Nucleic acid binder design. Structure first.
Ligand SMILES: Nc1ccn([C@H]2C[C@H](O)[C@@H](COP(=O)(O)C(F)(F)P(=O)(O)OP(=O)(O)O)O2)c(=O)n1
Ligand SMILES: [Mn+2]
Ligand SMILES: [Mn+2]
Ligand code: NA
Ligand code: NA
Length: 325
DNA sequence: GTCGG
DNA sequence: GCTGATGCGC
DNA sequence: CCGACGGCGCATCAGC
């Protein structure tokens, strides 16, 4: 509400850069700008005022003035009314269709969902599921449903082996009232970095399939599964939307570093890493390691919980819900 | 497009 | 058939 | 003024 108009136009520009211009860094530049401006507690009155914020520079300051004055961006009005551009940008909303496939589809007259359905034979497996669940994939997941989704995965994993440890991370773990998808982190005492188990993820994915929880597969290997799941319907009522689910199998010795990382948020991760640095540690998704006087990173430290990582860098344990930043 | 080195 | 590159979505 | 900006796992392609 504060600066929704500006953050909207920045977002739109970001998407044009990513899907049409194929300029992924300008995509992140516009988004970062949109994020800082979104957290800013006043209604912006000039470009110069926005420029004081980290991530907003000369050109965004220039666009903000154009918008504050005239209500629009000449550059966006033009973009909206190029057929190629808006078609390419739209097609990218299909999972498995990125800038490259989108531009290629539009190049041969394929511009809409209708055209994709007419041309199924031109789509790879991932893209077909993306097309099939197009509306379902753009829908958020209420927290109430996340909880039922969690019960199902936790219990089914328990049934396969009591030694498995599974954690639902992402915004859900941070306490959000809605999530984009479900990201499951999985480990086993048998799986470490040192270790010689090409069936650990599989056992779990096939159990989820057997109880009809997982319905489709996007990609699946020995460490990562990406697919589609669905809550069982009432036996009476409206059947549930299909949801994206990801399952990652991580060595036990790197498991709590992974939980930390995949819980985020991004800015929290960024701040944590910076503080660690100041304390003589380098944290990444897999490990925390002591830094040497010359900057050389030592061996991975023993981590048996998330709290362990906070102790190393002398930070009071931060509740997931307090990791917005 | 914006940044820090 | 093999390998490394590219596209994709986290 | 300059290159960095995240980079990993998996699926498919490109070029032998
Ligand atoms: N492209 C990515 C995305 C994520 N992550 C890791 C690093 C991130 O800390 C973590 C979660 O990403 P997140 O914070 O964005 C999210 F999913 F939880 P949020 O979008 O905020 O909520 P919601 O799904 O409802 O839209 O995964 C990553 O390594 N690469
Ligand atoms: Mn600078
Ligand atoms: Mn440059
Ligand atoms: Na897409
Ligand atoms: Na070929």
């Amino acid at each position: 509400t504060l600066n929704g108009g500006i953050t909207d136009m920045l977002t739109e520009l970001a998407n044009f850069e990513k899907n049409v211009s194929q300029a992924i860094h300008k995509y992140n530049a516009y988004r970062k700008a949109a994020s800082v401006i979104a957290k800013y507690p006043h209604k912006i009155k000039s470009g110069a005022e926005a420029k004081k914020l980290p991530g907003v520079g000369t050109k965004i300051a220039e666009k903000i003035d154009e918008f504050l004055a005239t209500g629009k961006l000449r550059k966006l009005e033009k973009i909206r009314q190029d057929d190629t551009s808006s078609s390419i940008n739209f097609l990218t909303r299909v999972s498995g269709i990125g800038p490259s496939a989108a531009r290629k589809f539009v190049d041969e007259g394929i511009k809409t969902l209708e055209d994709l359905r007419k041309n199924e034979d031109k789509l790879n497996h991932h893209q077909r599921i993306g097309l099939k669940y197009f509306g379902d994939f753009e829908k958020r997941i209420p927290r109430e449903e996340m909880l039922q989704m969690q019960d199902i995965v936790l219990n089914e994993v328990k049934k396969v082996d009591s030694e498995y440890i599974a954690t639902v991370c992402g915004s859900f773990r941070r306490g959000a009232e809605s999530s984009g998808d479900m990201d499951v982190l999985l480990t086993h005492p048998s799986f470490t970095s040192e270790s010689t188990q090409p069936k650990l993820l599989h056992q779990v994915v096939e159990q989820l399939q057997k109880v009809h929880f997982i319905t489709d597969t996007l990609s699946k290997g020995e460490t990562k599964f990406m697919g589609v799941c669905q809550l069982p319907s009432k036996n009476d009522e409206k059947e549930y939307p299909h949801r994206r689910i990801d399952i990652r199998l991580i060595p036990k010795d790197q498991y709590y570093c992974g939980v930390l990382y995949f819980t985020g948020s991004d800015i929290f991760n960024k701040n944590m890493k910076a503080h660690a640095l100041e304390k003589g540690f380098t944290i990444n998704e897999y490990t925390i390691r002591p830094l040497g006087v010359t900057g050389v990173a030592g061996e991975p430290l023993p981590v048996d919980s998330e709290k362990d990582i906070f102790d190393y860098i002398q930070w009071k344990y931060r509740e997931p819900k307090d990791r917005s930043e």
